[PDB]
Every structure is written in structure tokens, then in C-alpha cells.
Amino acid sequence: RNAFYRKLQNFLYNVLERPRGWAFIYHAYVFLLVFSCLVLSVFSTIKEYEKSSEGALYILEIVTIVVFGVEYFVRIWAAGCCCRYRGWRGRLKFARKPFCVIDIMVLIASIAVLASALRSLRFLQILRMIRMDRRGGTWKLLGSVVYAHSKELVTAWYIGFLCLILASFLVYLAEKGENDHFDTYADALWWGLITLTTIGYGDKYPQTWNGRLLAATFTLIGVSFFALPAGILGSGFALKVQEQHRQKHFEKRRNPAAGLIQSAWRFYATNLSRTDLHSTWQYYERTVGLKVSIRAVCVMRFLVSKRKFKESLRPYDVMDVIEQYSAGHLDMLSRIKSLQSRVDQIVGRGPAIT
Amino acid sequence: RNAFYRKLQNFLYNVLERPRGWAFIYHAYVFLLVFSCLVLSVFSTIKEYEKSSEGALYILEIVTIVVFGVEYFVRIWAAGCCCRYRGWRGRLKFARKPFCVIDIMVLIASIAVLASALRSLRFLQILRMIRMDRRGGTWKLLGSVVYAHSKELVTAWYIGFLCLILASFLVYLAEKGENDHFDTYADALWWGLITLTTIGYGDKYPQTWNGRLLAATFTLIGVSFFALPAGILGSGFALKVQEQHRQKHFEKRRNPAAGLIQSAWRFYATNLSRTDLHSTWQYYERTVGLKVSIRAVCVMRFLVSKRKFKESLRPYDVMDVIEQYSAGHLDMLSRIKSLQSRVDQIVGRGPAIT
Amino acid sequence: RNAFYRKLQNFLYNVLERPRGWAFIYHAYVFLLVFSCLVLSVFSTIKEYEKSSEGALYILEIVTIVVFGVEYFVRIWAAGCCCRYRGWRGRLKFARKPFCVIDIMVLIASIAVLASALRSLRFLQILRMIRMDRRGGTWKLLGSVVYAHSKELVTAWYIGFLCLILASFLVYLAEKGENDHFDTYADALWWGLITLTTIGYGDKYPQTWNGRLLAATFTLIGVSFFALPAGILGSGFALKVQEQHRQKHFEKRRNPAAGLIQSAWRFYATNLSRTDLHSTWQYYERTVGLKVSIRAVCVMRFLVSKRKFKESLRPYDVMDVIEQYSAGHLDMLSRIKSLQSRVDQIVGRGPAIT
Amino acid sequence: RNAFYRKLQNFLYNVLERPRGWAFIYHAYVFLLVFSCLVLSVFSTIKEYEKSSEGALYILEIVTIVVFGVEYFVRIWAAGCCCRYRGWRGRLKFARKPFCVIDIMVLIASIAVLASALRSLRFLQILRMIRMDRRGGTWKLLGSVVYAHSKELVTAWYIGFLCLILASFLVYLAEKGENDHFDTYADALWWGLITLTTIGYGDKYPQTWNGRLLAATFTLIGVSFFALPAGILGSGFALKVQEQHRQKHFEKRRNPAAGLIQSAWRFYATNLSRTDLHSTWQYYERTVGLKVSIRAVCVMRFLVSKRKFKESLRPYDVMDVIEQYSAGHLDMLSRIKSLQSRVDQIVGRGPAIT
Amino acid sequence: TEEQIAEFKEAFSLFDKDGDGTITTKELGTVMRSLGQNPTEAELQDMINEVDADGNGTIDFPEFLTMMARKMKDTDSEEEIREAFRVFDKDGNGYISAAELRHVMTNLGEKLTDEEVDEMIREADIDGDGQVNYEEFVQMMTA
Amino acid sequence: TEEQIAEFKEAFSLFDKDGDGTITTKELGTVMRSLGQNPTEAELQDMINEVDADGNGTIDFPEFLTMMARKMKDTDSEEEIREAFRVFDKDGNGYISAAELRHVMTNLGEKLTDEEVDEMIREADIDGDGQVNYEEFVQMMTA
Amino acid sequence: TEEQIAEFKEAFSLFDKDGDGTITTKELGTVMRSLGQNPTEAELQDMINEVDADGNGTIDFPEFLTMMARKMKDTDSEEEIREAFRVFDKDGNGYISAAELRHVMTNLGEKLTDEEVDEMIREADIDGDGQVNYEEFVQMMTA
Amino acid sequence: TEEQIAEFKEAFSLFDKDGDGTITTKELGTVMRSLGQNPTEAELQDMINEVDADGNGTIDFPEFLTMMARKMKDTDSEEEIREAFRVFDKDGNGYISAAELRHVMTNLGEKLTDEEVDEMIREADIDGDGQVNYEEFVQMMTA
Ligand SMILES: C=C(C)[C@@H]1CCC(C)=C[C@H]1c1c(O)cc(CCCCC)cc1O
Ligand SMILES: C=C(C)[C@@H]1CCC(C)=C[C@H]1c1c(O)cc(CCCCC)cc1O
């Protein structure tokens, strides 16, 4: 009941906060609901579909609002689970976080609207869509990748901007009079942009052959330099995700290392023959012929924990095995130094024994 | 005859099932036939080409159906080779597999149609084209790559969707009245989609300068984030293919390792001087001065197998050689530990001999 | 005052020359100013915005020119800090550099114009935008990447050019008469270019079905080969930036190595017991019971410097740790050779002692 | 004269055949000449530029033909240099190679045309442009990359083709009646192709909202899968070029290894004290106090060659250093095994000496 | 020996409640929760598999007394403990501060009571330094 | 020795049917298929080449006696056998279970009869453990 | 010994101006500026921390005598000095030219005066070659 | 010794034609083309530099006698020759066939006449195998 109450509070907090399994399914379902709300809004904007679209949108939005309200209430009521925030004071303290500010502002705006509204609805929908992240993971990853490849991205921007400016100016000069698409340099800049990005609307295109040749010569280089950032960002995304996975692997290594050291010390301090080991026997007594059984379970725990840790020492990378084996190489250096010292002792004794 | 019958059944089953060499050529030819059928259907849809296109399509489709029927019958009749499925009962059991269900459904639909039909023909053609894979290799590879890069792909989708929504809304605001292309937010969303993908049909484009400026400022970022997935998927495809090749290399290593161990034991147990080795001599007797000839054969087989295995231990990778050499490094650890023990014995004797 | 004068000159030269922190902020602000000037010029080209755009442009350009003048004067006056250029003669010698030639030519052209001018203004703005780099870092990086991937880029150009020529010619043959878009081979070449680059203006497109099929078959391959250079350049940019970062890491390793060797020698030559060490004591005296305090200072500096160098030996790469550990492996080879020599001595003595 | 004649023949053959330095400049100039010929032909196709374009084209083409003929004659006359082809018979034997067949066919076609010609001129221009390669390097590289990434490319083709077919069919169904762009499935297929490739001509686009929704939903995935091959090919090109560079590095290693072994044996066999070394002294005598001078020459050569080879053993890669150090690791295994044998001898003597 | 054999017989009887000579995973779970620790079914399964040698899902007496006589020197845990402490040595100095031991020993893996860390430091700070050399510690547990 | 030389002469006569002193690939093939094993022409070519030292496509008597006297200590197969068993040691424990040996021995490479695996375990399970230390097995094969 | 303890007491009194038994970072700053070298607050803090063992921000007498008695052989700087000289050995020959020492010693890190490099070469050019084998230098510094 | 010192006097007189005690690159070039081999100016420059120790562009007599007395055991060319032969050991067997030596010795680097390869195999084919163990070759060249 009470213990079950706290257990359920913690479990639901885990579901709402960092999810792993089925909590991800629930988050996907609520994401699908909000995405359907946005799609229904877009449909309602269509004139021929306005009636039924809005009719369904009203009910789907009331469902969305009740779901959001119950989610926020459960968040506040489960905020006491963590040791950081406990009780009503702790929950209110947690509610002060900026993300909770965003959630509550969206909630109050939505309830005010429900109880020219199209633009406010659009803004609120965009805000909740942004709210879907709940961790800034996407934004943090994008920022990290941009910062990591800042030099390449800035070089691409500089080269592409110079190419765009020069190509637009040259085509404008080559098509100032003949073509009415390029009556002003701003039109030429718009053309250069929609060409170097390969969008090519077709509203403005060169028609004079000098303009066509200049456009070709510059658009080759321009499209190359404008497509550069996509590849740069893809490589950066992959690299950063791999780095995060490596860090997670190393933490998953850290935990079984503690397990192994714990079990090894327990096994060594539960030896039957040795004395002054009450510091370990007292632990088993508090948890509770029995001595030998305790020793057996302890040594078997050590075996299983050593197996777990050894499996946890997967290479996962070239650098990882290189470091692990370099530890052993330093151990070899120490051992061979010891052998050198012993052989020095032997050669010193040689004259003595002769 | 009978043994030849089973051999031919196995060979043809291998041809239909996992092919390596010329069976791939046969599969390519049948794929070309079905692709020509699809192309002829598409041509038949063209009005000015309908007569001759349909005339050739009828005969090419009858050829396709007879080829498909003979292939399916040969598959069913050759399904008895594998130990999993033998005899009529085994063949019928194999026919229950979902892929055989797809093939038989396509066959019956085609024979019913031949013996508003255009849409059914189109559906059947797409179904057989999908059927061409026969192993889901492409689909499995795509799914594995998508799952592996789930975070990067989802981040790209989230950021690109937010960019599309915001750019479409801003351009819609900037061109609500002046431009008739953006009379509704749905039209603006369509424009944003066909721009950020760089398709740029040209049916809708901004014309107001505020709209043009917003479109540029947002389309740069949007095209970057929309082109991200292509690079991500390319990298994933390459990585997964390399991983599969590495696994295949390791299996090709596994087999000659067994060969080497087998030959080594056979040659160690064929030694002339040693006794209690009839357990190996009986095998050679069953296969059938002969003793020395058999030993020569055995040592020769050991030599060739050792050569094969050693060649099979190609580096193929940094991690592979790192692991192979780490085995030897652990061996060095053991040997130097033994030397340390022996030197400890020597230093213990030192006082004794003095 | 005077020393403060030289210190301020050097600090402001560092801000103006290679920047690290807030000097980058100042450079970003001046870049934003010049970019706003360029944007205002582009706006002034727009007819409906000409009045206010030009009105703001005049004042923003006078601000830009005063900022540029003060920056150039401060550059000339701070050019004396470096040992290469000192005094009025040194500053005038530095002013001869080609980049300063570009800056001064831009300045004089701008002041002449201020005190058909639109084209001259555009040229001057482009020139200063190019001038923003101040180090050719972007141009050097692009040239290095192009040279490094010269073979791949040239192969892509050759294949893509052949594909463009062949596709344009074939579509021209297939659409010579039916379509007025392809009345000349030059028009077909323009179409092939704006297709293979995926710009697709829409001014020219095949309409005959033979032309459409040829365009499809060739445009697949053509768009692949035309999009190749973007990926090639992205990979090259990433690789070159990583190489530069590795070199910077190795220099950051080089400096603490000197620190460590310096401190080690100082600590070894400041030993209290040892004599003939005045060469080290004199340094600490000219910098100025005291002797032991100096020894403590020296050994403590050695500890901190050793810590700095050790943390400076970060792997940063597989090759780096491989080289560092190969040094130790060669050391181990030498040590084991020494042990072999000593064991040879022992085995030589064995017969003698027997 | 005669020796100079053969030297010049070899030098010019190297210029025409595999060039390294300034022969590349000559090849670039002739490439520029032929490219100018092609550009002038394309210009001549333009009606308003026909007169002057053709006038310049005639003289530029006569220059091109004289240069081409003299180059071919010099190739035939310099083909006698190589040991494979010597004399008139050797030159005629070499002229049989398929590339010379292409060259001679182009020459005869050009001389026949010069001494409906536009189409033949275009074909000849394309053929000579293809001829510019002279080694198939680009074609070989592209084929190698395609074969290496066959699985990824085929998977991309399969998935993209299925996506194109399905999207075109669905849009055709959604726009069969409302839109006149999609009156036939072939038209819808053309739209789907020019959409998924992101060419987006704009001649055909969906207008019904069901069609627009389907087009968006499918074009996202389709453009991803259609842009996949560009990245795949870029990665393959980079990998293959790196592999070729590695092989070239290993050959540049192979040659100085022979140099080092040669010099080492010469220095070991030029020792003054050792006898039976006339086998090396005769070499120096035939090349021609002198003995010691020759030995000094030999040891000096050994030092310089050892330096050259050691510098030639650059890392260049993780695998390279791993292999080089694994050689030493095996050597260490052997040395430690020898030490184990000696320690076994010592422990056997232990009981004996006691 | 014989007396240790009798001790192991008593231990087996304590484990093998059924008395059939085979320890069942359910019996192991019961004895564990009697000891105050709750294991999981898969955890106990992998546990017995690690202690199992005959692949039967249980343990006969000879495997039990072999494990009981199985000294840790034979187990060859020197490298494993070395790697664990290296993992917890964020500096690579070859040692580890006492406070880090206090934090880690009672926060990860199977958290130990303050008494356990007290005995850990007692047998670790042989020189009274706090920055125990983990290599020395594993060497001492081995010896 | 001399008697071993006579035995090798009898063996060579058995192989070199033509009696010309050179073993032809066809002679080796016929003796193989007489033994009951069918080799391929390329396989036999690689075979003879692995023995062939004079580059003649055949083997003279000195090479035959060299292969006969070639003890596997000289061959230096310790590393190769170690690597093979490591390949088949899916865990890296330094040993391998008996059941894995039974499965692989008679299902991979040149499948061996049950008698061969029986003698394998007989000369391998010296401690009667089943989890044979493959390193010890190769060491005893070498010794 | 006792006399060295008294010398260290004099040194501590010179350092610990306050006389409270704890050397403050500010006291270290004053003594450094008296010595003619100006350190930074963060530099001095990390410096004492590398010297600090009780985590107090200062140093007690036992730590001062520990660092005074801390012979560099215990420090184990062989590998570090080896790596530094290898870093400055642009060729990898195992040595380094005298001119490179003249340039580096007086231009990098804490630049040393000509006298320091003179004594460096004096105690380094034992063979009078100039191309000092830095392995020998580190070995003699250790010895 | 003194007699070898006078022999080196004669050698230097042969090299140092000018007699100033400094060997000029032009003197080395003329003596080389007298010997029948034509070096390049940069090649001879790198030559002297590798032998040059005083950084003067020439060689004083002490350096010449150092190079004369410089035995190859000091040079430590074991690893270099090992790597060269491994480069030419396309199989990694630890040996190399005689025919490959005949081809390589007279086709790459500084091609050697048939006499040189004959003496090479004479002093290398100690066991008359042809598949010379290059490890043994470098070891004997060192010994
Ligand atoms: C400086 C860049 C970006 C490279 C390198 C220099 C040159 C010759 C062209 C660029 C480039 C293209 O811009 C486009 C292609 C595709 C084929 C174009 C058909 C003419 C290849 C191609 O290398
Ligand atoms: C020589 C290149 C560049 C490859 C390999 C050969 C072939 C089959 C096609 C090229 C290619 C495309 O040009 C386009 C796609 C995307 C799907 C196209 C839908 C029909 C895949 C695809 O492999």
C-alpha cells in the first residue's frame, strides 16, 4: 500500500522521465496523438476540408488536453519520488524548472483558447512539438556537431557565399537587359541562391548564352560547396553518436568492476582459517554450518562476478584493446626490470662465490 | 542414375536457393525477363504505343508465366534434397513457408487473370518484383542500418520537421496576401516540403521580398538537414557490408582451423614408433609398407593444411591482428612468469649453496 | 606608461592579428557590420526599397569606413611590436605585404567613391568581404583538400562530363524535331547540365517518350556522378581539419616536454650534497636556510611539470599510443638483449666454476 | 648523337606514355586544345554565333589535327624504345593495341571528314575526348568502386526502384482524373522519377491534396534512397585511392630495401682483413691505397642507404606499424624461448653442481 | 581433508534440502532469501551454470567440494582485479585515494557496509598512506 | 637410419610406381584413390608444391626422406595449433569443452570418425575434466 | 636525519611565515615573488595540490619532509624523460644534437640561461660528441 | 692502430686531393667517377651529411678515422636488414628462395653482378638449402 504507493510513484516517474522500454511506447503514442493534432490543424486550414477537419480537431484536441493535464499532474505528484525533491515543497520546487515552465505555459494558453485563434493554435502546436524532446538531446547533438566541425562549416559558408555573390553578379551583368528576370541585383541574388542550392524553381533562369555559360561554370562549384554541409553534418552525427556509445560502454564497464572488487574482497575476508574477519560475518548476520555455507555462496558470487566483469571487458575499439594491453606491457616492463635486478644480484654474487 | 538424380536435385536446389556463380546468371536473366515485362506494361499504358506494346506483352507474359511455373515446380520437387524436408511430405511442409505462399498466390492470380485487369496486372507485377529478392537481404540491411543510426535519423527528422514547419509558417505570414500561391497554410507547407527537399517544382515560390529572404534563410538549413539522411544511410550501408564481410572472413578462418587440427592429430597419431594408435589406423583401413605410405600421406596433409590455415590467418583489420598478437602477449606473460618463478628458485638456492 | 604603452600595443596587435577569445568577438562584430553593409546595398538595388535602404546605407558605410580607417591605422602603429618590424621603418616595411596592399587599395577606392558608382561599390564590397579572412585559412584548406583528392575529383569530372555530353546528344537526337526546347545541341547541353545537377529549372525538358527514357537512364548515373564531389570535399575537409588538430596536439606536447626536461635538470643540478652546481644557483640568485627552500621550490616545480607533461601525453589516436608503446617495446628488446648477454656470461662461467 | 637519339626517343616516349612532371603540362595543354575544339563546336551549333564560331573552328581543328598526327607519328616512332617493341617490326606490333586502333580510327575519320557532317564531327569529338584518358584509370577506378560496393549499390537500386514504382502508382491513382498531368501511368512514372531525383522540372506535379500527401510521404524516403549512391561512390573512391597510395608506398619501400641489402653485402664483402673477397673487388676494378678508399666508399654507401631505407620505413598506417612491431614481437618470443631453454639448462645443472 | 569433507557435507545438507545430492535452483533461492539476499531466477541460473560443470542444472558433491577447495590463486584473478582497479583509477597513477574507495565501495555493484570498507582500508593502508597501490592489494589477496 | 632408409625406399616404390625416382601427380592421385580418398588436381598440385623444393612438379628421394625425418618439433606448429584452438574457443577461457570437440571434430574440415575423437579425448583428458586446456594439448603434442 | 630535520624546520619557517604549521598559497606567492619568479594563483594551487596529500589547501611538516626525502628514483621519471627527449628527437636516432639542445633549452618551457645549458652539456657530453644519447642522460640522472 | 692510422692517412690523401684536410663534395665526385660510378650533387651532399658530424660540408680526419673504425656491430643494422629481407619475403616464412635472391639482387637498388650473388649464396647457403633463413644471414653478417 504505502510502500506500493512509493514504488508506483517511482515506476511512473521513470516512465514519464527517462524511458527505456514500454515507456518509450507510451511516449511514441502521445507523440502520435500530438502529430495527428498538428496534421488535423493543417487539414482544417484547407478550405474544402475545413468542416470535417475542424469537427474532428475539436474532439482530438480535448483528448490531447486531458492527456496533457493528467501527464503534468502525474509529473508534479511523482516529482517527490526523487531524493532531490520530496513532499509538496519538493514538487513545487521541481515545477520551477524551465521545461515545466514551457509545459505549464502551453497548458494555460491551450485552456484559455479552448475555454484569429488559428495563429495562436499554430504557435501552441509548434511549442508542444518542441516540448516533445524532454531532454534537448537532438539540439545538444546538433550543437556539439556544429561546434566540432566549426572550421569546415565556416569555410563552406565563406566559399559558398563568395561563389553565390560572384555568380549572381556576373549573371546579372550578362542578363541585365536581355532578360527581365534579372532587372535588379536582388533578383540575380535570388536566382543564384535557388540555383546553387539546386532548388531551381524556374521563375528566374538565364536565357542569354553568356549568362548560361557563366551560370554553368559557377553552379558546378556552387552546388558542390552548398552540398558540403550535409555530408559534414552526417559525419559529425555518426562520430558523436559513436562517442556517446563508447562512453556508455565504459560506464557499463565501471559498474561490474565495482561488483568484482566487492565480491573479491568479500570472498577474501570470509576465509574460514583467517581471523579478525567479523567485519564481514556481521554483514551476513545482519542480512539473515552457516559459516561454510556463507563461504560457499561468497566464493560462488566471486566466480559469477568475475565472469560478468570479464565479459564486460569487450574491446569495442582498437584504442580500448591497445590501452588494456599497454597496461600488461607496463607490467611486463616491471617484471623484466625485476629480473634484471635479480640477475644483477647473481652477477654480483658470482665473484663472491668464485 | 538414382545417385545422379539426387545429385542433380541438390545442384538445381542450390541454383534456385543460395546461388554463387552461374545460378546468379540465371537469376539475372529471369530478373531481366520480369523487368522487361514491367517496362512493356508501362509502355502499354502509353496511348500511342498501346497496340504493339500489348501485343508483345501478351507473349512475353505467357513466357514469364511458364518460366515461373517451371521454377516453382522445380523448387517444390527439389525441396526434398535438404535433410529438413524429404519426400512428398517434406516438400509439402516446405511449401508452407511464407515466401512460397507469396509465390503461389502470385502464380494463381496471374493464371486466373490470363485464363479493369490493368490494375490487377500492375499489383501482380509489383508483387513479383518484390519476390525477386528471395532472401530479404536488401530489406534486412536497410532495417539494420536504420536501427543502428536510429538516433541520428530521428534527430535529423525532428530538426528538419521543425525547420519545415517554421519556414512554411513564416513564409505563409510573409506572403498571405501578396502571393496567391500561399493562400492557405497547407499550400505553404507543400512549398516548404518541395523546397527543403530541393525538388523545387516551381508551382509555388515566394515573390514578396520578405518571403524570399525568409525562404533563403530557412532553406539553407533545411536543405542541409534534409540531405543528412542520405549520407547517414550511405555510411551505415558501408559499415554493415564491411561487418558482414568480416564475419564471413572469420568463418572462412574457422573451417581451415578445424582442418589443421584434424590433420595435426591424424599425423601425431600415425607415428610409427608410438603404440595404441590403431584407433587412427582403422580409419585409413576402412577408407581402403602401407603403414609408411599412410604416414607420408598424413604428414603431407598436415603440411598443406598448416599452409592453408596460416594463409587463412590474414590480418584483414587492425583489431584482428591486435587480438592475435595479444594472445602471444599473454603467452609472453606466462613465460616470463615462469622465468620469474625459476629465478626465485635460484635466489632461494643461493643461500643454500653458499 | 611606456612599458604599459608597449604592452597595450602588443595586446591590441594580438587582437587585430591572430585572435583567440574576445578578439574573435570583435572580429565577428566587424564582420557583421560589413555583412549588414552588403545586405543594405542589395536592398538598395531593390526599386521599391531604394530610398530608405540608401539612406541607411550612407551612414552605415561612413561608420564602416571610419572603423576600417582606425583599424588600419592601429594595425600600422602596432606592427612595430613584433621583432620583425620595429619603429616607423618597420611599420612601413610591414605595410608592403600584399594583404595590406589589398586593404589600402580598398580603403582608397572607398574614400574616392564617397568623396555608375553602384558597380564600383559592389566590387569594393566583394573585395572587403574577401579581405575578412586575413589568413587564407579557408582558401588554403580548400586547395589542400582539392589537391589531396585530385584523382577522385578529376575522375568524377571526366565521368560526369562524358555522361553530360552523351545524354545531351542522345536527347537532342530524340527531341530534335518534336520539341522546340532542343532546336540546337547547345540547348540540349544546357538541359543536360541543369538536369544532371538536379537544378531542373523546367525551361527545357524532354516531352517525347524516347527522350524521356534516355533522360531517365542517363540522369540516374549523371546525378550520382555530379553529387560525388560534395561528399569527396566533405570527407577531405574533415580529414584535413583532423590532421591540423593532431599537429596542434603534438606541438602542445612539445612545449611541456621542454618544461619537464628543464625542471628535471634544474632539480638534478640543485642537489644539496653535490658540488660544482653554482651554474644553477646563480640563476635563482639573479632572479632574487635559503638553499633548502630553493631546493624545495625546484623539486616541487619538477613534480608539477612532470604531472603536466604526463597529462599532456594523451593518446589522441591509435597511431600515437602505438608509437609511444613501440618506444617501450624497443626498450624491452634492449633489456632482454642485455639479459641474454648476462645469461651467456653465466653459461660461460658454468664450465669454469665446475 | 646516336646514344643521344635513343635517349631522346626514350624521354619523348615517357612524355607520351606514363608522365610525371612537365609531360603532364603538355598533356594538359593538348587536353585544353581539344576541349576548346569541343566548345567551339557547341558554339557553332548556336545559330546567332554560327559564322564566327565555325570560322575559328576550322583553323583550330586544322591545328588540332596536325598536333594529333604528329603526336601519333612520334608515338609510333618512339615505340621502339621499350624492349617489348624494337625496330620497325616492334613499332608495327605495338600499333596493333586496341587504344592505337581507336586513335588511328579517329585520325582517319577526321582526315576523311576534313579532306550531315555535324553528327560525324560530334561523334569524333566524343571519341577523342574518351581517348584523352590513355590508361583507363578513371574507368578502372569507377569499375573497382562499383564492384566493391556492389551490394550497397544494388540494395539502393532495388529499394529506390520499388519506392519510385509505388509512389508513381499511388499518385497516379490519387490524380488520375483531377490532374491532366497524370492521365497515364507512364506520365506518373516520369513525375516520380524527376521528383525522387529532386530534379523537379515542374511540368508534372500533384495538385490534389491526397496526391500531395502521398507525394511528400514517399518523396522523403525516395530522395534519401536516390541520393545514397553519390555518398557510396564518394566513400568508395576515397578508399580505393588510399589503397592505391598504400601500395605505391610499399613499392617505394621495396626498392630501398634492395638498395640496403646490396650495400650491406658489399660492405661485408669489402672487409680488408677477410679473404676470398675478390668476387666483390672485381666489380670495383671493372667499374674503374685504392683498397682502403674503396672500403670507405662502401661503408659510406652503406650508411647513406641505411638512412634512406630507415626513412622509407614510415608508419603510413596503423596496420603497417602493427606488422612491423609484430615482427619484433615474434623475435622477442624467440629470444625469451632461448632464455627459457638456458634457464632449464641451469636448473638441470643445479642438482648436478650440488 | 576428512574433517573438511564433513564440513562440506554439512554445507551440502544445508544447501540440498531435498537430500537427493543435487542442489536445485529453487533450493538455492530459498537459502539465499534465508540469508537475506534476493536473487533472480536468471541470475541464479547463470550463477549455477558458472558453478556447474556437468551441465545438469544442479550440483553434485564433487563439484561442490572442488569449488570449496578451489583457491583463488588457481582462479588467476590477478589481471581481472588489476583491470578493475585501473578502471577505478581515473588518473593511472597506479594507486587510488581512500575517499574514492569510500565512495565506490558503497555505491556501485554490491554496496558494502561501512565495516567492510573499514576492513578494506585496514588491510590496504599497510603504509598508512590512503593512496593504496591497487597492484599491491591484488598481490596480497593472491598471496 | 639404414633400416629407415629401406622402409622409405619401399614407400617410394609404393608412390613412384613408374620407378623413375620422381613421383608424378597422377601416381599420387592413384595411390590416394586406392587409399579411398579422392583429391583434386589443384589440391594435389598444392600438396606437391608444399613438399616440392626443386620446382620440378615431382619429388626426388632426398626430399621424401626429408619429409619423413621432418619431426613436427621442427615444423613449429605450436602457434598455429594454438590459434586454431583459440578460434574454436568461443569464450577465450584457455580451454574447450568436450562436447564442442565432439561436434566440431566430426563436422568441420575433414570430418573424423568417432574413434579419432575418442583417442583425442583419451590423450587430452589427462585430468578427466572434459574442458581440455588446448594449450596443454598442443604442448604434449609438441613434447 | 635530525640535522636534516632541523634544516627542513628552517625551510618551513621560511615558507610558513604565519608560523601556524600550514603553508598558505599566498605565503608561497610571496616567497616566489621574493625569489624573482611570479606564479599564478591557479598555477600555485594546482602545484600545491600535486604536493598536497591531506586535501587541506596547505601543507603540514610531515608532507614537507616527505617531499624533501622524496628521491627522484622513487618518482620514476625514467619513462617521462625518455618520452620528452624522444619528442625532441626529430629523427628517432636515440640521440640529439647539441645545437638543438642550445635552441630548445633556452626557448621552450621555462627558458634556462646559458649557464644551465653549459652544465647540461658538461654532464651530458661525457664522450664529447654533442649528439648526447638521451637514454644515457636519463640513466645517469636516475643513477 | 698506428699502421691502420697511416693507411687512413693514405686514404685521406687519395680523397682529400687538395690536401687541406677537408674533403670537398667535388673531390668526392671526381674520385667517384674515377671509380666508375657517377653520383649526383644532392646524393653526394646527403652522403657527406650522413657521415658529416661537424656540419661543415666536409670531413676532418677524426671523422674519417671514426667511420673507418666504425664497425657495423655498432651501427646496429640487425633490425634494418631484418626488415629489408622481410619486405622481400613475400610469404613471411622467415626464409627466402634462392631464385628470388637472384632476381632481386640484380634488378633493384644498386644492381649487383652475378659474382656478388654467387658469393652471397656461398656465404649464406651454409646448409645448401637455397631457402636461406635471412635471420641467420643478418646474424652471421653481424657476427
Ligand atoms: C573545386 C571543386 C569542387 C571540384 C574540383 C575542380 C573541378 C574541375 C570541378 C569541381 C567539380 C564539379 O564542380 C562538378 C563535378 C561533376 C561533373 C561536372 C561535369 C562537367 C566534378 C568536379 O570535380
Ligand atoms: C554506376 C552507379 C552510379 C550505380 C550503380 C549502377 C546502377 C544499377 C545505378 C547507379 C544507381 C543510380 O544511378 C541510382 C540509384 C537510385 C535508385 C534508382 C531507381 C531506378 C541506385 C543506383 O545503384
Numbering used by the authors:
A (entry chain G), B (entry chain A), C (entry chain D), D (entry chain B): 70 to 184, 195 to 367, 535 to 600
E (entry chain H), F (entry chain E), G (entry chain F), H (entry chain C): 6 to 148
Sentences from the paper on this structure:
Among the neuronal KCNQ channels, KCNQ2 and KCNQ3 form homo- and hetero-tetrameric channels and are responsible for the M-current, which contributes to the stability of the membrane potential. Each KCNQ2 subunit contains six transmembrane segments (S1–S6): S1–S4 form the voltage-sensing domain (VSD) and the S5–S6 constitute the pore domain (PD). The C-terminal domain (CTD), which contains three helices, namely HA, HB, and HC, interacts with the calcium-modulated protein calmodulin (CaM). Here we report cryo-electron microscopy (cryo-EM) structures of human KCNQ2-CaM in complex with three activators, namely the antiepileptic drug cannabidiol (CBD), the lipid phosphatidylinositol 4,5-bisphosphate (PIP2), and HN37 (pynegabine), an antiepileptic drug in the clinical trial, in an either closed or open conformation.
To decipher the CBD and PIP2 activation mechanism, we then determined the PIP2-CBD-bound KCNQ2-CaM structure (KCNQ2-CaMCBD-PIP2) at 3.1 Å resolution. Like those in KCNQ2-CaMCBD, two CBD molecules are clearly observed in the map of KCNQ2-CaMCBD-PIP2. In addition, between VSD and PD, one PIP2 molecule is assigned, with its fatty acid chains switched by S1III/S4III and S5II in the transmembrane region and its inositol 1,4,5-trisphosphate head group pointing to S6III helix in the cytosol. The inositol 1,4,5-trisphosphate group interacts with positively charged residues Arg87 in S0III, Arg89 in S1III, Arg214 in S4III, Lys230 in S5II, and Lys327 in S6III. HA and HB, together with their surrounding CaM, rotate by almost 180°. Along with this rotation, S6 and HA, which were connected by a loop linker of residues 330EKR332, now form a continuous straight helix. Consequently, the coiled-coil-forming helix HC, which is directly connected to HB, rotates by ~40°. Therefore, bound with both CBD and PIP2, KCNQ2-CaMCBD-PIP2 is in an open state. The binding of CBDs likely stabilizes the PIP2-bound state by pushing VSD away to ensure a sufficient hydrophobic pocket between VSD and PD for PIP2, enabling us to capture the CBD-PIP2-bound open-state structure.
